[PDB]
Symmetry: D2
Subunit: 227 residues, 4 copies
Amino acid sequence: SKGEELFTGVVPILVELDGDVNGHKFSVSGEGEGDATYGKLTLKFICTTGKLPVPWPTLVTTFVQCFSRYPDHMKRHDFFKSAMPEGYVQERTIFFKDDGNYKTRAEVKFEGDTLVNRIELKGIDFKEDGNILGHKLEYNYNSHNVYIMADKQKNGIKVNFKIRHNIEDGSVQLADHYQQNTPIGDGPVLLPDNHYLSTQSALSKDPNEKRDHMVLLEFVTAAGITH
Amino acid sequence: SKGEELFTGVVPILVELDGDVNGHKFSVSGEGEGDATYGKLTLKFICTTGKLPVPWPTLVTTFVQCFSRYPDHMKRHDFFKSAMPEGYVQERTIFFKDDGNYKTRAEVKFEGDTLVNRIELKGIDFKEDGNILGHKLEYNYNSHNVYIMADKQKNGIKVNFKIRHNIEDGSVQLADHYQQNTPIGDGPVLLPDNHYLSTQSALSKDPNEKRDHMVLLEFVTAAGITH
Amino acid sequence: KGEELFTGVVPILVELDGDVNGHKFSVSGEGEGDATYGKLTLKFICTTGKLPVPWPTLVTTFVQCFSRYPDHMKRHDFFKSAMPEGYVQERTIFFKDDGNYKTRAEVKFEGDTLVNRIELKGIDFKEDGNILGHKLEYNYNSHNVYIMADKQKNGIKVNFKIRHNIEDGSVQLADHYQQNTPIGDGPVLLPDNHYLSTQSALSKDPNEKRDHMVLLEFVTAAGITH
Amino acid sequence: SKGEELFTGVVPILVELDGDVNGHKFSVSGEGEGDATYGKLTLKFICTTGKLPVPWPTLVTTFVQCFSRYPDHMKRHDFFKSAMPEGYVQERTIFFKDDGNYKTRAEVKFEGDTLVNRIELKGIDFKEDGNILGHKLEYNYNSHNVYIMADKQKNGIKVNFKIRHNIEDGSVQLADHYQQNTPIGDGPVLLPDNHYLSTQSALSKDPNEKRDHMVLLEFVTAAGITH
């Protein structure tokens, strides 16, 4: 696609989140860069309002799948870049099993030369000492496959997957993601055949950072089509 | 599951289909056996009303995913076998791009020792000389991945894939499958995490058979989960 | 250029002369292949009487040129690149806690037919073992066939390990060491590392009176996205 | 395996390399940690002798496959952890196409609680303004599959793969890796069936490091077996 050309090199990224979980208001800013040639992303996030009231891992998926590596034989199936530079709206409900849910709406688009992800997040019905508000999640992250299907009737894609968040007692907290992506612009976009993105995420801390924060490095690669 | 135990050996299969496509009524009977240990099916189908009014390949998916091979590490994700012996209802709409659609409802269940797939099919809005009613599909079949997700609210699964049917002129006719499976019985079933079935289908003819018929050999293997 | 020979259905002939612990036998096979789908259909007949080893032990010996190589991997298809002049395929197959087969085969076009002519020598088999004692089930598992280039022979090296189910619930392993080299002087494609995913269905012809095997196989290359 | 248990948590790593390429002697020290539960490694390398006389990316493979994530269903095929704590010897020849070769011998083993990788490297027959000694490789890295087979006679494994190093002019420099691993100790080890490791590597710099260095984050995951 035309938008594919915008991602041949390193692109700067900004992320802004305004959040409210069970009435706890918070904001996070992020910055870094993506190199879609390698499916690779490097981002740092800071909670600018103080302590983050939910665990950092629960927000990883909310905080730019346009940075995925699509191998040459799958490039006709990259919706995310074809929607650029005008961007796409990304909407999710994330259901935490036996707990509350997040609803998010984000615009992912170029603003100048920067790829910007602006998100609003509302969480409701969380248990006050559940795994989320009780900060019982480990600071780590599993590998996941993100399943993508076209929704031609709605001019976009539907995406589903279930994050496994490791809990400090050895169990797992499931987070079932229902996601829709829709172009913002008027121009032609690619609607893909069914496939998935293999995603690996490394969480870490910046030793020179005293605020509440997360450093994220991710690899994302499309797979599953040989026709 | 308990249903899994019913599939450790060779199981006889019966298939019955009552069809109506654009008013053309027809019936097909099939028989054979399945060996889920190898994910392998062998089936022969006969049009008992005379000439089949649609191409045989368009009906392959309609004519028993309980015969899939689920590797040991994925056995908790096998909805199909978990619903047995009481069975499941399988409903599809199959949209042939630039042409009509099939709507199917089937019961797949044990009747004595035999796995039986009983189907009603209604096709509408087909073009009198499109690829289907004009018999322009080649007598072959491509390999496909069948994408499976849980549908917890319906105590079953939602399934999607798009068959690529080769046309005699070198082009491809797509057939977009929207599928749902729901248990017939009240007992618990296994609701899976997202995965897919890799399916390979070989079509042939019985040299001793003078009626309009199709011989099908299929391999079906679950994949995509390592957690 | 060899690719072009496989765009449609290609008739196949297989001929094998075997000697296992001195038991001499011959098998003739025929059918066809459609590499567009990676699909083979073959029927084999023991023309000397009863086959003295189980039919499943010979499946891999009885035309990987019929593999489906998806478009993005077409530069890695050695097998077709060697056609029509063909390739030599040699193996040693070690049956764990039992004897071994050694095979040498030529796979090439003879007219418009793809022909696999094999010599097989088996030695040191136990008369009461899984092979000569016919304790293998008439079935077959799915396997990955691992391929590497052998630049100094201008061919490939191939390795994999067949799991043959035994009639008591155990498994008999057959470790395959394989080498393929071009017969002709023409250029071939030396591949990057990859594998072939293979599935095999064994059956019987209900009217065939001779000792025989009907085989349907699907073979698809995978592992490369660069 | 017993050695598997040593990797259930975060394990500190030390790396030491003495090298000679075309007579250019250098030393590199590295340190960090590995978390095999996630197949994750974080390492920083410093050239303690001054400037590195070869490009950093050519040494990535030389600088602890015991940190691979083996999924539960493949754990009997993890030779690398089975050889711990006594360790293994890893030997390679790396043939850079149209250029010279590296030959390496390393011991990878526990010294107390730390996993240490100690390497000697000799490089010969490099061209003076080839891609290597001419420093024409880009500071990036592609994803690779690492192919493993058992070597029963050596009580270890034989490993082969070909690294694709991107060049500054758009081309690729190949580096064909012939590798052998053998146990240092005499205790039992796990000899695997054929499989591979999917590997992803992110190269970066420490903004406050003035010495010639490389920061490496890697993910490694075993695949290819379902039996």
